[PDB]
Design a binder for this molecule. Structure first.
Ligand code: HEM
Length: 154
C-alpha cells in the first residue's frame, strides 16, 4: 500500500501516454475485459448485445464509456494513494447500484495492464508493470474497504 516515489513516477509516466489517446485506450481496455471475462459484459445493458470483438470495435458508445472510466481512474492515480475523495462516489455507485464485486475490478485491472503492455512495450517493461500492478492493487483494496465502510461486501 506504500509505493516508492519511483514506482509512482513509472505509473504516472505511462499514464501520460494513455492521456494522449484516452478514448482508444478506454475502448481497448473494455474490449479486453469483455473478451477475457465475458460475464462482465452482462453488467452493461448498453453493451450486452455486442456479440463479437468486431462489433465491440465498431461501438462508438463503448469508446465514450472508455473515456468515462479512464478519466476517473486517471484522477485517482494522480493522487498517488491520497484518493479518499475520488473513491467516495465510485464506491457508492459501484457497490450499491452497479453491484460490481471487487473481483471484477481485479479483471479490469488485468485488462488495463494487458492493454498498456501491448500499446507501450518501451515504457511498460518489468519495473513499470510491477508499479502499475501495485497502484491498481492499492485502488482495489481501498475501494473494497470503502464498500465495507458503506455497509457492503465487495
Ligand atoms: C477502474 C475501474 C472502474 C472505474 C474507474 C469506473 C468508473 C465508472 C464511472 C466514472 C462511471 C459513471 C459514474 C458512476 O456511475 O459512478 C461508471 C459507471 C458504471 N460502471 Fe464503472 N468503473 C470501473 C470498473 C467497472 C467494472 C469492472 C464494471 C463492471 C464489470 C463497471 C460497471 C459499471 C456500470 C454498469 C456503470 C453504469 C453503466 C451505464 O449507466 O450504462 N465499472 N464507472
Amino acid at each position: 500500500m506504500v509505493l516508492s516515489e519511483g514506482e509512482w513516477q513509472l505509473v504516472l509516466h505511462v499514464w501520460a501516454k494513455v492521456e494522449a489517446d484516452v478514448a482508444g485506450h478506454g475502448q481497448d481496455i473494455l474490449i479486453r475485459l469483455f473478451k477475457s471475462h465475458p460475464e462482465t459484459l452482462e453488467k452493461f445493458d448498453r453493451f450486452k448485445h455486442l456479440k463479437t470483438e468486431a462489433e465491440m470495435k465498431a461501438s462508438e458508445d463503448l469508446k465514450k464509456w472508455g473515456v468515462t472510466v479512464l478519466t476517473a481512474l486517471g484522477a485517482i492515480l494522480k493522487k498517488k494513494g491520497h484518493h479518499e475523495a475520488e473513491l467516495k462516489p465510485l464506491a457508492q455507485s459501484h457497490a450499491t447500484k452497479h453491484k460490481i464485486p471487487i473481483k471484477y475490478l481485479e479483471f479490469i485491472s488485468e485488462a488495463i495492464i494487458h492493454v498498456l503492455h501491448s500499446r507501450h512495450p518501451g515504457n511498460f517493461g518489468a519495473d513499470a508493470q510491477g508499479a502499475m500492478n501495485k497502484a491498481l492493487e492499492l485502488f482495489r483494496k481501498d475501494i473494497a474497504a470503502k464498500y465495507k465502510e458503506l455497509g457492503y461486501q465487495g
